[PDB]
Amino acid sequence: MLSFQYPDVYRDETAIQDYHGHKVCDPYAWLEDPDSEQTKAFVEAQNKITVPFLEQCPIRGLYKERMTELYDCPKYSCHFKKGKRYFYFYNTGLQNQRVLYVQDSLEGEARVFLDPNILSDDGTVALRGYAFSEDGEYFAYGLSASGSDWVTIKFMKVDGAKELPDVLERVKFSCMAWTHDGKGMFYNAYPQQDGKSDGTETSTNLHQKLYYHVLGTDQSEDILCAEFPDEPKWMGGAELSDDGRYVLLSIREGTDPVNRLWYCDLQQESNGITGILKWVKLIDNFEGEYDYVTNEGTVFTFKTNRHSPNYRLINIDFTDPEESKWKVLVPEHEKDVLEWVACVRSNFLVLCYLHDVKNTLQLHDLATGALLKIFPLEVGSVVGYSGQKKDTEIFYQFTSFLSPGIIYHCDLTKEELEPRVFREVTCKGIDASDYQTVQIFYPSKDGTKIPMFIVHKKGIKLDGSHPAFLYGYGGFNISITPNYSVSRLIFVRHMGGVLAVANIRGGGEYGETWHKGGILANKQNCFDDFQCAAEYLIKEGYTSPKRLTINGGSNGGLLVATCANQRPDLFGCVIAQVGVMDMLKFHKYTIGHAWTTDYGCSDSKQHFEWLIKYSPLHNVKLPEADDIQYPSMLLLTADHDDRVVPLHSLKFIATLQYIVGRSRKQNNPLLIHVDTKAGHGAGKPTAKVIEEVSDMFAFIARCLNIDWIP
């Protein structure tokens, strides 16, 4: 099987660091410099062995072609209305980037408004964030190059789609909000830094500031409105109130669902926006999340987790703000998580709930919180929604494992609110008739029942003979809900596979207590939950260790790398995308300092003791048992991933190849592919997406020796 040899990779045996009396060697520390010839030569040598391995077998071509055929189907996003026009995103199917269209009415001719495809030859310039002026006549949009988190904000006049001279640089993790006078727009930017700012650098991002740009001026004239010079990690996101009277500032430090909430009454600014605003520090701590829904005068409605881990809606009156005075508008449910809330047609609230990892959508009265209407939905997820305060209608989009998607529309001016199918695209995709989705709850190591979705062909024999693809994430309060994936359905249909998604702790599926159950000292719970999911699939006869693949991206890449270290006997195949591998150093690079609320930080002796036990980079160990080797492993990363710097996967693969790959009993491949002109994932062109997943399933196919099923 293995007719290549791993590259010789220099070990710096002097690279030794003391962590609270514990010595740690880091012989591949030099891979932390993305600009060096050594690092670039390392990447080239790795790609040189991985690429022929993935492309040798005809099944890659078979998968790629089938995927291309199936993607070649027109896809619409949700409509939304802005000012007097309707907008939606559209892709004929294989366009590298989806295109923004505009029409004057719902039944009128649409035309191209913004087409990012014309901004590059290869589709690697992507739309990242946008904001219309309050009247919908002006348009700000972020552009990212090569998948980087770095953004350039450009501007258009909507009528005639006219490009304006205004350009904003050094924008990253920025909210964009226009004042209702139409004068200019708030946004975030970072101060000048040494070296590159194009996504290839590892430089930490600190001292994010809030600025206001007056339309028609140079960025150098922009007003500084808030900064936190004594708190370099703080990030302030601005948002105008629905009536245009208040700027709200949500200050975050880390990724926990908590924020400070300050406000500026813009009518109280002597001479407009001319400097640091008169911030009133309504919530001046990080004990809870306060997510603005709407206001009526000084009565502000927020979604909160303050003493309510499943979330609820409260009203805070700015003229009587003490916590004892807050009114609970919509109380917390015992089990169901309030995911999000929008205000539409003045006095309606749209609440989206998560009930056992499935969405329900409800309409409530703003004045009382009373339930008015349940929007009927099949089992799955709501993944698009539009409808703001002055709108008299909503669109929302439904998706699931076996359903390609339906966009609904509801006219909220009608006495009886019957929603209707607005759009469904009917292509001859995979026939889902012979497949089903089941939800089971399996016991973890500590007895906790964990949800898992299983997608498979009806009436399969549970004899352990099927290839299985087990997906997890497990962190940052993210819920992994049903989602249509062409790539996974090809695995099911043409590779005879079983798909599984485990809703392990760390996620938000059962609210903040689910999240806390999988972070910090309890991070091991995530790994136990996921290994227990694998054991469930095997024990129930869905699959066998040698037929089982696990996959995760980002925090999920960490998940699968750890499970490979901890239970190599349990998996045949492991695909870790853009994973955090160095748990001792992650905080030093770009935005990694923000994840310490989930992971902890190695500067603390306590935290170090948790991290060292699971840090994938520090736990690569040849299995003791003579009959156990590491599973086949593929790491996927990219050279402009400045979310999770590629040095994570670089050092980890060098480590796998030295510690395990050198052993004569290791015959399973341990490989990395580093893509170019790509980043963490968002805005990746369709062409690169197809390349990547074709690589993944080709890797699976040949390591399991699977026949394509026509």
DSSP assignments along 258-302, one per residue: --EEEEEEGGG-BTBS-SS---EEEE-SSSS-EEEEEEETTEEEE
Distance, CA of 577 to CA of 557 (rounded, Å) = 5
Please give the DSSP secondary-structure letter assigned to residue 180.
T
Distance, CA of 33 to CA of 16 (rounded, Å) = 17
> Residues with Cβ < 8 Å from 426, sequence gap 6 or more?
none
Cα–Cα–Cα angle for 254, 256, 261, nearest 5°?
85
Q: Which amino acid is at 364?
A: H
- Residue 525 phi/psi, 5-degree rounding, is -55, -40
Q: Solved by what technique? A: X-ray
> Residues with Cβ < 8 Å from 3, sequence gap 6 or more?
none
**Catalytic residue (one of 641, 642, 675, 695):** 641
Structural contact between residues 387 and 374, judged by C-beta atoms closer than 8 angstroms: no
- Beta carbons within 10 angstroms of residue 561's beta carbon: 29
Distance, CA of 647 to CA of 448 (rounded, Å) = 35
Q: How far is CA 373 from the centre of its chain?
A: 30
Cα dist. 189→67, 128, 223 in Å? 39, 15, 12
Number of helices (H), then strands (E), in the chain? 10, 39
Domains within the chain, CATH numbers bracketed? 1-73+427-710 (3.40.50.1820), 74-426 (2.130.10.120)
> Residues with Cβ < 8 Å from 551, sequence gap 6 or more?
469, 470, 471, 560, 574, 575, 576, 577, 696
- Residue 124 phi/psi, 5-degree rounding, is -95, 15
Distance, CA of 99 to CA of 362 (rounded, Å) = 30
Distance, CA of 397 to CA of 380 (rounded, Å) = 10
Distance, CA of 516 to CA of 526 (rounded, Å) = 11
Q: Is 407 helix (H, G, I), strand (E, B) or coil?
A: strand
Q: Which amino acid is at 120?
A: S
Strand partners, 86: 81, 103
Q: How far is CA 282 from the centre of its chain?
A: 30
**Both tokens assigned to 380:** 């799955």
Structural contact between residues 263 and 283, judged by C-beta atoms closer than 8 angstroms: no
Is residue 20 part of the annotated active site? The answer reads no
Cα dist. 124→77, 149, 250, 577 in Å? 21, 13, 31, 19
Question: Exposure pattern of 22-54 as b/e (b: 16+ CB <10 Å)?
Answer: eebebbbbbbbebeeeebeebbeebbebbeebb
Distance, CA of 529 to CA of 305 (rounded, Å) = 25
Three-class SS of 415-465:
CCCCCEEEEECCCCCCCHHHEEEEEEEEECCCCCEEEEEEEEECCCCCCCC
Q: What is the H or E stretch that residue 617 is in?
A: none
Cα dist. 652→50, 66, 470, 527, 655 in Å? 15, 33, 22, 18, 5
Inter-residue long-range contacts of 52-57, CB under 8 Å, 24+ positions, other chains counted: 52/4, 53/4, 53/669, 53/671, 53/699, 54/673, 54/695, 54/698, 54/699, 55/698, 56/702, 57/698, 57/701, 57/702
Structural contact between residues 92 and 74, judged by C-beta atoms closer than 8 angstroms: yes
Calculate helix-pair angle for 686-704, 58-71, nearest 10 degrees: 140
Distance, CA of 658 to CA of 231 (rounded, Å) = 41
**Catalytic residue (one of 174, 308, 554, 602):** 554
Q: Is the dihedral of CA 2, 535, 504, 602 positive or negative?
A: negative
Is residue 446 part of the annotated active site? The answer reads no
Is residue 602 part of the annotated active site? The answer reads no
Q: Is 583 helix (H, G, I), strand (E, B) or coil?
A: coil
Please give the DSSP secondary-structure letter assigned to residue 676.
S
In angstroms, this model's resolution equals 2.2
**Catalytic residue (one of 166, 680, 694, 695):** 680
576: region left, alpha or beta (phi > 0 left; psi from -120 to 50 alpha): beta
Distance, CA of 217 to CA of 273 (rounded, Å) = 15
Structural contact between residues 198 and 150, judged by C-beta atoms closer than 8 angstroms: yes
Q: What is the H or E stretch that residue 102 is in?
A: strand 99-103
- Residue 682 phi/psi, 5-degree rounding, is -65, 135
Q: Is 329 helix (H, G, I), strand (E, B) or coil?
A: strand
Q: What is the DSSP string of 532-563?
A: HHHHHHHHTTS--GGGEEEEEETHHHHHHHHH
Any idea which residue has 């988190």 for tokens?
A: 149
From the number of C-beta atoms within 10 Å of its C-beta (0-12, 13-18, 19+), residue 689 rates as middle
First to last CA, the chain: 25
Distance, CA of 615 to CA of 162 (rounded, Å) = 51
Cross-sheet strand order for the sheet of 406-411: 381-386, 393-399, 406-411, 420-424
Structural contact between residues 393 and 33, judged by C-beta atoms closer than 8 angstroms: no
